[PDB]
Amino acid sequence: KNKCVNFNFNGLTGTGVLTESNKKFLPFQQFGRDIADTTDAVRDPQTL
Amino acid sequence: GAISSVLNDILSRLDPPEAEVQIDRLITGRLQSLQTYVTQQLIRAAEIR
Amino acid sequence: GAISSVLNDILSRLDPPEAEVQIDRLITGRLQSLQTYVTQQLIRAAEIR
Amino acid sequence: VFNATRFASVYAWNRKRISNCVADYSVLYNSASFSTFKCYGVSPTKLNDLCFTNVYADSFVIRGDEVRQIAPGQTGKIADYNYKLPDDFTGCVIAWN
Amino acid sequence: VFNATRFASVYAWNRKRISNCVADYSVLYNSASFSTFKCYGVSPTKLN
Numbered sequence: 059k060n061k062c063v064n065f066n067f068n069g070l071t072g073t074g075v076l077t078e079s080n081k082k083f084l085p086f087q088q089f090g091r092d093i094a095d096t097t098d099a100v101r102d103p104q105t106l
Numbered sequence: 107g108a109i110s111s112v113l114n115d116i117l118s119r120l121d122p123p124e125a126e127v128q129i130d131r132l133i134t135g136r137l138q139s140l141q142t143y144v145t146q147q148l149i150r151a152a153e154i155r
Numbered sequence: 156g157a158i159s160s161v162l163n164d165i166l167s168r169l170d171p172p173e174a175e176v177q178i179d180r181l182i183t184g185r186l187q188s189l190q191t192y193v194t195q196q197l198i199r200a201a202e203i204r
Numbered sequence: 205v206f207n208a209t210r211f212a213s214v215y216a217w218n219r220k221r222i223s224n225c226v227a228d229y230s231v232l233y234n235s236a237s238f239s240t241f242k243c244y245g246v247s248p249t250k251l252n253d254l255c256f257t258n259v260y261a262d263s264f265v266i267r268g269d270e271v272r273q274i275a276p277g278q279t280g281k282i283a284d285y286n287y288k289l290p291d292d293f294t295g296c297v298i299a300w301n
Numbered sequence: 302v303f304n305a306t307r308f309a310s311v312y313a314w315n316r317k318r319i320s321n322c323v324a325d326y327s328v329l330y331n332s333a334s335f336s337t338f339k340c341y342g343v344s345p346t347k348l349n
């Protein structure tokens with residue numbers, strides 16, 4: 059966390075700094091998107 | 107016109123020779139997206155000036 | 156660059172996946188024509204303003 | 205799915221769901237089986253790097269000369285009538301003798 | 302045209318002019334004849 063990494067999370071390839079988000083996702087909600095529609099946040103498939 | 111907007115998605119799906127065809131569509135569209143912005147900004151700057 | 160400039164001609168000849176390739180040639184040329192028009196109109200209006 | 209003894213006919217085709225498992229497609233190239241393998245939508249080599257959510261393999265049997273007429277947008281006595289593929293469909297073509 | 306007994310050689314090829322008639326191309330899909338059938342210029346199903 060808190061470091062720039064090139065990551066692939068549940069078949070989603072991206073590069074960014076991973077930080078713990080205070081937003082509350084619904085159980086089905088996984089991949090979040092910003093105004094630009096680029097991925098804002100994801101959910102760890104191993105330990106949710 | 108490309109399959110997907112994400113570059114990391116196209117690079118993860120199509121062949122390197124195949125991805126260059128669809129990436130060519132995004133860049134050309136993003137150039138026109140940037141050219142349209144710069145063109146307006148150059149024109150809006152003349153309005154501000 | 157398309158086989159014809161009529162949409163009804165391309166849709167009635169090539170496949171729907173094949174027509175999108177030729178329709179991409181029309182719209183790209185029609186966007187560049189419309190963006191150039193809007194570019195001039197913004198510049199011509201600056202002369203009028 | 206691939207190695208099954210007798211597939212369902214192309215007239216009535218069985219839909220085999222693939223979910224909650226680990227799909228390694230390098231096994232296809234490890235031992236020689238499939239004669240004709242081509243992926244229109246993705247890369248055969250990147251199938252292991254990037255993975256897919258819901259995999260549905262439709263098995264059937266068709267005449268040999270129609271392997272070239274089965275593809276998105278292609279036509280034929282099968283594609284136009286019995287079993288058709290979407291024009292925007294992304295997938296792979298798997299065939300063997 | 303299609304089911305003619307003997308075509309001309311490719312050296313001197315026959316030019317068959319088809320006009321003033323009704324062409325139903327669904328017959329080609331009715332009985333299997335052509336081994337390789339593809340249309341580069343237009344769609345084969347849109348021929349009718």
Ligand SMILES: *[C@@H]1O[C@H](CO)[C@@H](O)[C@H](O)[C@H]1NC(C)=O
Nearest residue numbers: 068101102103104105106224
């Ligand atoms: C495995 O996955 C499950 C469910 O996502 C998770 O609860 C568990 O912590 C993961 N790790 C192990 C070793 O089970």
Ligand SMILES: *[C@@H]1O[C@H](CO)[C@@H](O)[C@H](O)[C@H]1NC(C)=O
Nearest residue numbers: 206207208235236237238300
């Ligand atoms: C199918 O399974 C049999 C029995 O395990 C094996 O002998 C054969 O090599 C397999 N063939 C293919 C195409 O995987």
